[PDB]
Amino acid sequence: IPTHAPKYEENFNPDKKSYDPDRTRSEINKMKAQLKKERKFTMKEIRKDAK
Amino acid sequence: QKALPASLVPQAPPVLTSKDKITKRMIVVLAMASLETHKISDKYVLLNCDDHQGLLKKMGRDISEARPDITHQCLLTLLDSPINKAGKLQVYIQTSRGILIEVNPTVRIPRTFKRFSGLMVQLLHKLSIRSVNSEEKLLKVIKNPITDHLPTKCRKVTLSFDAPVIRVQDYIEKLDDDESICVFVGAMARGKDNFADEYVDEKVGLSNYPLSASVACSKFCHGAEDAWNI
Amino acid sequence: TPVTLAKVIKVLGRTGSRGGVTQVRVEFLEDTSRTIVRNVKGPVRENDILVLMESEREARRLR
Amino acid sequence: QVDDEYAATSGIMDPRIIVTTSRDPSTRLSQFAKEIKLLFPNAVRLNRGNYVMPNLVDACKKSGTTDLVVLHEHRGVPTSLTISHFPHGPTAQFSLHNVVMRHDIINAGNQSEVNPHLIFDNFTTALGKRVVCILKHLFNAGPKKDSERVITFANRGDFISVRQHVYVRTREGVEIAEVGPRFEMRLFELRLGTLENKDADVEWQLRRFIRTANKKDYL
Amino acid sequence: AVPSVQTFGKKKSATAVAHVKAGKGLIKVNGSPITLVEPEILRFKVYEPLLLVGLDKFSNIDIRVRVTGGGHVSQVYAIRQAIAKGLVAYHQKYVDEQSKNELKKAFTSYDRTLLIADSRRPEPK
Amino acid sequence: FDRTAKPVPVITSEVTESLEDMIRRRIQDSNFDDLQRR
Amino acid sequence: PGVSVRDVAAQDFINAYASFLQRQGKLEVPGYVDIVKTSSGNEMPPQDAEGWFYKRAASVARHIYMRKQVGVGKLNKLYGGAKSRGVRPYKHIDASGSINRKVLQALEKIGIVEISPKGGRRISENGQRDLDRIAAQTLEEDE
Amino acid sequence: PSTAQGNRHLVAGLSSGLLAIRTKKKKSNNFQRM
Amino acid sequence: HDFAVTSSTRVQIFSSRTRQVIKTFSRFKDVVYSASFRSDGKLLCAGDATGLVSVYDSYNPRTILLSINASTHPTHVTKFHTQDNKILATASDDRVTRLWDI
Amino acid sequence: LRIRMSQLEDALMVMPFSYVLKFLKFIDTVMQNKTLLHSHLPLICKNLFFIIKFNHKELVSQKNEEL
Amino acid sequence: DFEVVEEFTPVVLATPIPEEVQQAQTEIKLFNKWSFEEVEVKDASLVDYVQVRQPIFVAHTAGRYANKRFRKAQCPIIERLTNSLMMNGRNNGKKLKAVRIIKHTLDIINVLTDQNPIQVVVDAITNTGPREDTTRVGGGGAARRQAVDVSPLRRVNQAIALLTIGAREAAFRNIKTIAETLAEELINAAKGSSTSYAIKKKDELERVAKSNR
Amino acid sequence: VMFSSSLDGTVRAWDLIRYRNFRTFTGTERIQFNCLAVDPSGEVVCAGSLDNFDIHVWSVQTGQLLDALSGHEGPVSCLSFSQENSVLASASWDKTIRIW
RNA sequence: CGGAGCCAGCGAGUCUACCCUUGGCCGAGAGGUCUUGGGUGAAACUCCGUCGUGCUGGGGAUAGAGCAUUGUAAUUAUUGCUCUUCAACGAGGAAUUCCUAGUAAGCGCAAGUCAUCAGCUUGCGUUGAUUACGUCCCUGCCCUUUGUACACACCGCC
Structure with a gap:
């Protein structure tokens, strides 16, 4: 039977995301998540003080 | 002719x-x-008897039951047995927390212990592990009960110490040409050998001595190799 | 193994059976006078036939 | 007192209620509709899918059901309920605003299912008496006086806060606990025929765009 | 001037009007013959009012069916209902009552939904 | 500027204890309103 | 008897008339045939490049028999369909106007159809005599 | 075969890579009432 | 009125009135060797150079009905019984013929 | 006695025919002690007549002179 | 001897009707091919639950069988097979596709085993339905099973279920389709070959019931 | 025992031993009854009117109105209990027989 | 992938020389253009040739080239189409929720009705099942414990 080696990262953490080996696509994914949460919080707060 | x-x-x-x-x-x-698995604050670990004084006692449990080393050294024995190389074996495990893991024959389980610990953390939290050559998926958490995945003609026995002792060679040539054999062995440190009462019709044993877990696995595998001429 | 057939004559009610299992009272077909109490799994009604792999065993409750 | 299209069977007969969703409901709306059918008793739930509303109304009012609660959602979050009383009676349709449900929060046990007590807070106008009658003739008449669940319809500036509580009466007061869904519903329309037509005469509907809109309550 | 008979066959929203009169024996659904009624696996659902009683009942009468509404299977159920109760009504009015209730007995022994639809639903449990 | 209608009330601890001790008073003195049998 | 296009099915009229307009060869295939896709939603051109134009000509002949008077917009909205456009849900598209104008001009100069009042084009007299005859020989050869 | 009832064939396939087939083949209703 | 010609890695059914290929069977992996019709003329067996007898139904090349995996050697002759209908005799380069119930 | 009248016709219907035969043995012994026969006459009559009325088809097919 | 004349002129219609279609007025066959007479249920206790005594023309009787308890014991068993074939999320509602693949599998059942495919599928039902089973007697959750018998409606239900889902998993990613895998399954279940998913599952259920009887 | 229903709104029961009307069943809606049907095991009497579309189900042991069966859309013309399996069959002028 | 046949029901206030349409013509395509007047049609389905269990041709995210429509003016590429580039991704654990006939589920088409909704909501038809329809054994919730109400019968002090 053939025998493959298992791919896994060492010192795994689920809460952190996976370490992508590109610093210009992991960075855009990080800052897309950052603008989504800050935009959502910002416009939530301005519509509730408008209320 | x-x-x-x-x-x-x-x-x-x-x-x-x-x-x-x-x-x-x-x-x-x-x-x-x-x-x-468990959190440290920053870090995830697999619960040992040795990575802690009282993380298990803070979780409530006792430290004697946190033994992943023995399922590691069973998994090594089963996947280095010749029947696994010949391709007449597959290894299912089921955690005491009720998590069923299917283990491919093609996997190379790492030989030291904490490499296996870091493998088990990612298996338990990502529910799947691919190969380095990334072509197939060779260690995965699947859905309970195990009888949905076992073959349709399959005699399911369990291994113990207090049971009518058999010999593996004549016991395996008793069963017929399409029947498989599902052997529930307990990977505890100690405990009652009743972990699979609801799947099993025959509770057997291999020796008259208190038999270790991987020794019971290797005994049944070597008997199967002699019965199937491997 | 020789099997035997048995027609339901009475679905027993108010027995304290486990749900999804109903006691029943069946009489045989080779001698249609002697009965035995069995307990079946699926939906059963009167005068339908069911198949007994053994008939040397009366049924208790299940609970 | 009991008004002119409820007076025939006010306390003579128990009601009979259907609770049904809008069309192809989400799972939280199905959980919500189960919560509404075991909010009020002798209510059963009916799986609306591929049901036309005229023959649904006709099948209900020849099977003998007293009234119908149709629930409308918005991505899980339920937004409307229409109560249609069937012997050519009224439909009060409401919007639901702050919905928190027990299927969302907590396995806190099971409910109580007793004929509850009912609290109505400051329904002072005649439209308030009308909506009190339409909200309480979908409950069972004459509970036991030691029934230990109460529900409350409290008007808070045209926003009916709706809650459900269980209670014991201890030595120094009364200790309350919150069961079931809390709301603030608000009536946006009454009309005098059933749900089938929308050609029925309107007794009340809110005027959103008049310039004296936010000056009064039950406008 | 001709002895003619009109019946109706309904399933969910399909509806089929069948005119039966005396003639040479032609059975036409929507202008096309009956042997063109698609989806072609339910063509025997359309045929069974003919094959249950024999084509010698249809050898002297011509039927025409106009089918609107519905879908494929609702239209074949409307067609077979219209054909069946149209043959029954023709043999009632212009042939003898003994063949009338022989036709009713044959269709009702096969399925009475050839003659009476299941119409108003649901049940509020 | 100006707006159409008073928006939906944000439920606070003080208003939930307001209707809470309201119904405490109500179900203490049992002055509630149900139907009666005919 | 009584022969027509209503008397014979879809396939047995369309591919029989396609064999007819194949072995007559008076068709003027567009030349940019073997390239085109009959729509914008079919990732490629037809599998039987030596004759799919004849089959389409027979199909529009049958369809202009059964309907009264259609045009190229009607034939495009007819021959269109759904599309697996990507990850998004699906919305209906149109067929290919150049191919439809080419086939209608082809059988226009053949003489089966002709331009009518209100616009569009109907069966001519010679084509009306022509179309049901090949269905009569369809039943004749498939007796 | 023995019951061919139509155009009858002898076929021979060669090792050269080709196939050889040799076959043998095979007014008014008023006026008619008059 | 039809005949099947076994060339390399395809079997073509010709018609006996036009002499053109009406239908063709091309989904073999190696050289197809034998191809015969059943006595009812309803289905067509073809032995292949990999020892895989594959029987389709005639006049439908897309529905392979069953693929008997015979010997690992090339199967060189496959024909149904002429009296019986449900037995198929395949001989191969294994010096042993086999009768298969289909 | 301690079984109730609502589930007595079920209590007597649950039991099989071997228990019916030993119920008949019980009744046969109890009507020799004529003290507790006469203090339970309608109960003995009701139970015994329901038992053999329900099990009549099998009882008349038993072949034993003892019974 | 004695003979009845009951038609007195050869019946010809103006609409031409095919010869096999007008041959179908002497006997009702399924898809005008498969006869329903001499189709017996070779295992008693399942006659009166597998229904083959009203012949049909196609497996699309739109009658209502799910509003009384044992009313689905007289849906024809071809249609019960069809309805059980049209189930998963992919193939829900598609009864015409299910009827079409039932037609294909009866054609290839007959062309493989040259016998009546309705008799083959009836034998497959009566060989597949398990005659014993285990319930889990609880005791609060004490993992012990007790062997019960099993009623004939449950045997027909579980027979059709085992056959159809065995055909699905046997067609899951192989070259064969659902019609060909269902044909192989119905043939093997009819003769009882222990190579089928369905009667291997029956033998397992009956053997476990024999074990903790 | 013998049961009778009349146009004055009442079903009532008659002992044919002591010749006493011992039971009288009325509805709640003031309707006139046109047909009745009793249980075999005479626990329940049942009656239908020609102006109410419901079926009125009374217990005989107590006197109360046990149920009002609803579902006909036409006046319930006739009632009958099956003598063996005790299923109720009503049939009404909405062209419908119904089995309860 | 490439052709073909076919089957609905809701609904009915318009930019009236730039909106929406019938038809002719141009381009493979989108779209253009010119005249006419102010809803026809669904998808799943059915049939006919070809492929083939393999990141598969299932996939289409990502990057390039080209043709247009539009936004003053592309000037961060407005969106459509054509050809390449073929990443990720293989039905989803423990647990958990809902569900009994035109029901679950598949499928499209319209509307947008003083609250709500367009990051969607509500209608409308098309196709349409499997399994319970028993039971209080488990989990709970409820009711009663004088029979009262008039006979007959049963019960016979929680």
């Missing part, structure tokens, strides 16, 4: 999985494995 095969060059055996409920094989089920 009987001719040869048309091709004497040796093919690799077909690696079997739960998607083949036809072929006669040997299933080995490592029951009551101690595979739990």
